[PDB]
Design an enzyme around this catalytic site. Structure first.
Site, short mmCIF file in Angstrom:
data_model
loop_
_atom_site.label_atom_id
_atom_site.label_comp_id
_atom_site.label_asym_id
_atom_site.label_seq_id
_atom_site.Cartn_x
_atom_site.Cartn_y
_atom_site.Cartn_z
N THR B 12 10.41 12.46 16.68
CA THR B 12 9.98 13.05 15.49
C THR B 12 9.74 14.64 15.60
O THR B 12 9.87 15.54 14.68
CB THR B 12 8.30 12.67 15.46
OG1 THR B 12 8.37 11.28 14.72
CG2 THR B 12 7.48 13.29 14.33
N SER B 27 12.41 6.70 20.29
CA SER B 27 12.34 6.24 21.75
C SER B 27 11.84 4.74 21.44
O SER B 27 12.00 4.25 22.74
CB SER B 27 11.14 7.22 22.24
OG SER B 27 9.85 6.72 21.87
N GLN B 28 11.49 4.19 20.40
CA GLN B 28 11.41 2.69 20.62
C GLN B 28 12.68 2.06 20.78
O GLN B 28 12.61 0.95 21.41
CB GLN B 28 10.76 2.32 19.33
CG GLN B 28 11.66 2.49 18.10
CD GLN B 28 11.69 3.76 17.35
OE1 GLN B 28 11.59 4.89 17.99
NE2 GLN B 28 11.39 3.74 15.94
N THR B 58 7.92 9.94 21.24
CA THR B 58 6.41 9.57 21.72
C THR B 58 6.09 8.31 21.89
O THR B 58 5.26 7.68 22.91
CB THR B 58 5.35 10.18 20.70
OG1 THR B 58 5.06 9.22 19.69
CG2 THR B 58 5.77 11.45 20.23
N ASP B 59 6.88 7.20 21.34
CA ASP B 59 6.52 5.84 21.55
C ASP B 59 6.86 5.42 23.23
O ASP B 59 5.72 4.61 23.57
CB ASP B 59 7.60 4.98 20.59
CG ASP B 59 6.93 5.02 19.20
OD1 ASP B 59 6.18 5.79 18.84
OD2 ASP B 59 7.88 4.26 18.36
N1 LIG Z 1 8.74 6.69 16.81
C1 LIG Z 1 9.95 7.76 17.03
C2 LIG Z 1 9.51 8.95 16.68
C3 LIG Z 1 8.14 9.56 17.44
O1 LIG Z 1 7.29 8.92 17.05
O2 LIG Z 1 8.39 10.77 18.03
C4 LIG Z 1 10.09 7.72 18.45
O3 LIG Z 1 9.63 7.44 19.55
O4 LIG Z 1 11.08 8.53 18.81
#
Ligand SMILES: N[C@@H](CC(=O)O)C(=O)O
Ligand SMILES: N[C@@H](CC(=O)O)C(=O)O
Ligand SMILES: N[C@@H](CC(=O)O)C(=O)O
Ligand SMILES: N[C@@H](CC(=O)O)C(=O)O
Lengths: 326, 295, 302, 308
Positions: B12, B27-28, B58-59
């Site tokens: 994000t 990142s998921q 962040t995931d």
């Molecule tokens: N969910 C997405 C975007 C975010 O949450 O940063 C990721 O982990 O890349």
């Protein structure tokens, strides 16, 4: 004084070690009677009478014990003024939420456990049980759904979770906070759960000896699709995804679950993240695939609700609709 | 001025600063090949810059952060960052986080603290940092031992550094590796099926991490199956779905009888990172248990 | 077994399991509830530990919980013994149901007897956790788990009588400080004033009228002050009075370079030190210097 | 679209840095507001909330009570330093049960990643949500709806500083939508006995801190001023340093109302002098001030602290 029935199931509150000092102990040995004895003061606050339902570590808790607890409580509600359920800490957030969705008695039903074994130096079980009886005997506790009383705090069964592996202060309602605090045997309640509980749910387990099969799959980097496939290959009724972040899924797990949802398996997106909701309108379009967003329900609790929801409906839109209300 | 390289990986969220996109994935979907590429990328270019900022989703940032914390042999600061709000949103959190991460990466005081995560004005260690809330910009916390430093007005007040080993103190080198050993994670809960564990064992995974209940405990089905798998050579690490605190030895589970490893404060996905790396060296649970006592 | 001395002060001298981990010796130093703690007990404690440091392997101090985080930091800055010094107390009465005192006292001795606990400054052991003397603070009014290091976290957790240390305080303590109480019978006079809407300036001015050496402000937000209080503390600083800006807010630093021009007035920003803890460093600061810069340097280094 | 009135008092949302942007500058910078509410904006004051006082409080109560019939909800932009005090004061004195939302910002508007715009956006979302009515006066910050009684500032610098540290938030904002799952039980707004409509003064209540070796001069200074009340920021469970207790006992004996609170950030000051409950010292001051507008009896004041 009120009549309070103590239904025992085991736990570290019912565990004993070899020492006041070593941490080595075994769960679910001591009987309900020995627990009551350790707290003579209860007779100042309630006429207690214990019944031993099971005596296990709640890491082995399962549907049979749950259905047994719900039926016993539903059956004996007009025989007593309230209930205290002695339970192990590991899955106590699961049973509290199950009973919260299946008990039709609005008399106080209060769960309690201990993080230190009864043989431990400064064991927490005696005072916890004492405050559970206080909570159960308090008229103001009625109609707030199933409660968990741990560490001088009254917590609702929907949002209570085990936060720390060993801390006596481990239980916290991490999204919306506790309902009230116990000081010197009195509770000042300042909150009550808004989601439907106990007598207001459509779930009836009187004629139910089994619940639909619901498994949980975990998400992480490089995550194998083999657990998801195994639950599909076995034909579970539902699968809860312990997702990453806001309920996201690893690509191979998503593929297996997207297929399973088309072919009727109920699929619920929850999250491994300890607080906050798995929302709709984020990176997964639930309606497109027939998935359900679990809201603030963590994976073990989303499993409880999904199981009960599968006794009323297959329909993904209906299941989501249940997750928006319970 | 110092030279800082931004290696973008996704998320994000999308000094003399130099910017490079290594991969771009949510990142998921993070996986072994990106980790291998990313550790190789940093070890190769370490000599060519004074510090790295890695922008990342962040995931699973807590998973990549720990992998790099164990595989990067460069002592220069490596600082990961992401963003909980999209960069087009009102009050997007990415811009200030990236700024603060460059500040962290440029500060001579950040060196030798291992791989760091900088979110919401705070410097967090790669080992303990975890995502605690699904949507809050303050989500990343070091839930067992707290943060290393706080950042105000481009200056850092560091009062802590990790005692566990990281970066150039670990024996783990993935430079000539193209694969990592297969390690899966199974969840525990009431009435749980052993089917997930059974499937990974049947697939001959090298290791399985147990997201246990409470202090690393397992449902009787799962625990029978993993005890059987542990004796057949599958490495088994007891972790906990409980978000804070250690899975200890000497509680209810007699690890030595069963060949189990206690994960300590490493949560399941972080325990998986260390197990993977430990399985490139030893496979004896007793040698793996010291690994989990040092890193 | 290590030789461990227990210095009692009061709280909530002569637990059998203590004997399995150390040879315990006790003497009652004082006997007050800690809501009544004071400069004279702090001087006594510090001189006591510094003189007997070579007679023992480490110390456990039993103390009331209410101001334990103040005595811990004062001893952290004045004890020249590098051997373990551990403070402990209890949040429930000893005669209580599920009293926490016995297991807290047990784990404190475990900590004082662990050679790995030395060189980490003065320590607080409560609820299975090992806490640094600087950051530890009472976070709840009744919880047994009340004590936390709210800015930077614990040093280690105690399980099965074993401590897994993973952190140590970066800020100076014990033998790395210039503060020496061995010569002093009294400490500079430092008081604390609270800030809130429509706050009165009468309490600050009373301290100025009594000629205090320093005043700590529990400000609002990032160390901010109600207009009358800031007029009053500006006047005190003009006459030579040291002024430290702290915050009623329970976590986070009172930073310089924010809303208050500290160098104009000669104010000092307390960093993460909460009001009662900033009073400790400022009293000790004032035995060494009165210069606002020198004092800012000290709040930055200890 | 709902009619929302914004009442500006200043703060960093409008303000190293110096309340100086106008209400209409805050509203104009969030054009998205036009798609959820017809925004109307008034400047009550423009100060740092570290300088908040009784006069602004009396004016805000009066404005909301008078104009309640003329709008659908209120957002009060405010400094974060004392926003937890103003919110509880309004919580106890506004007789309007339409949404009343307070909002601020921890970063200046010119800061990158400034939190003001989305905070205000969320404040107006909340004030326009009819589900927010009858919940008391609200504080909306970092995507979260917080009751005015329990909310407090927990960190000096964090965008996420505001937390209802004893019983938790009422609701969370996700994509312009609130899932309310709690409301306050203690009585508020039109359910309180306090009318400030014709007051130009509030009774005088001060706060004194407790710590090791603590000087009694601050309490004496407030006893000497004849304050109507004194709140003690006590140690642990409302305890007092010896010399401070001696002076407050003198104050109580001569008619000064004394409330025991605690400098400890979470948990109640229990009975077993008025016990403050879960009210921190600056919240205890708000309630005590209001209680002294209708009684001087310690015992009747305790009943009030047990109801509101
Ligand atoms: N969910 C997405 C975007 C975010 O949450 O940063 C990721 O982990 O890349
Ligand atoms: N066996 C664990 C969990 C439980 O019984 O629920 C305990 O000792 O508490
Ligand atoms: N009564 C509490 C607080 C105090 O004495 O300061 C204790 O003894 O720990
Ligand atoms: N001093 C400012 C701080 C802020 O708004 O964040 C105020 O409270 O007005």
């Amino acid at each position: 004084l009120p009549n309070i029935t103590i239904l025992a199931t085991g736990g570290t509150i019912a565990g004993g070690g070899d020492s006041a000092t070593k941490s080595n102990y075994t769960v679910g040995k001591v009987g309900v009677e020995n627990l009551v004895n350790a707290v003579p003061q209860l007779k100042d606050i309630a006429n207690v009478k214990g019944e031993q339902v099971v005596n296990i570590g709640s890491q082995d808790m399962n549907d049979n014990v749950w259905l047994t607890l719900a039926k016993k409580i539903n059956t004996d509600c007009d025989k007593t003024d309230g209930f205290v359920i002695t339970h192990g800490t590991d899955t106590m957030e699961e049973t509290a939420y199950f009973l919260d969705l299946t008990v039709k008695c609005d008399k106080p039903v209060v769960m309690v456990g201990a993080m230190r074994p009864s043989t431990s130096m400064s064991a927490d079980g005696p005072f916890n049980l004492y405050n559970a009886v206080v909570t159960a005997a308090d008229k103001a506790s009625a109609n707030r759904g199933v409660l968990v009383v741990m560490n001088d705090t009254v917590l609702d069964g929907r949002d209570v979770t085990k936060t720390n592996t060993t801390d006596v202060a481990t239980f916290k309602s991490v999204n919306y906070g506790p309902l009230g605090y116990i000081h010197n045997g009195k509770i000042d309640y300042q909150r009550t759960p808004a989601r439907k509980h106990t007598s207001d749910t459509p779930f009836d387990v009187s004629k139910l000896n089994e619940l639909p099969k619901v498994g949980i799959v975990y998400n992480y980097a490089n995550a194998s699709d083999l657990p998801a496939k195994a639950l599909v290959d076995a034909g579970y009724d539902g699968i809860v995804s312990a997702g990453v972040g806001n309920g996201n899924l690893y690509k191979s797990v998503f593929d297996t679950l997207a297929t399973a949802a088309k072919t009727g398996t109920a699929v619920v997106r929850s999250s491994r993240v300890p607080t906050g909701a798995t929302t709709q309108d984020a990176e997964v379009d639930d309606a497109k695939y027939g998935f359900v967003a679990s809201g603030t329900l963590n994976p073990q609790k989303a499993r409880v609700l999904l199981q009960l929801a599968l006794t009323q409906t297959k329909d993904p839109q209906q299941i989501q609709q249940i997750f928006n209300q319970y």
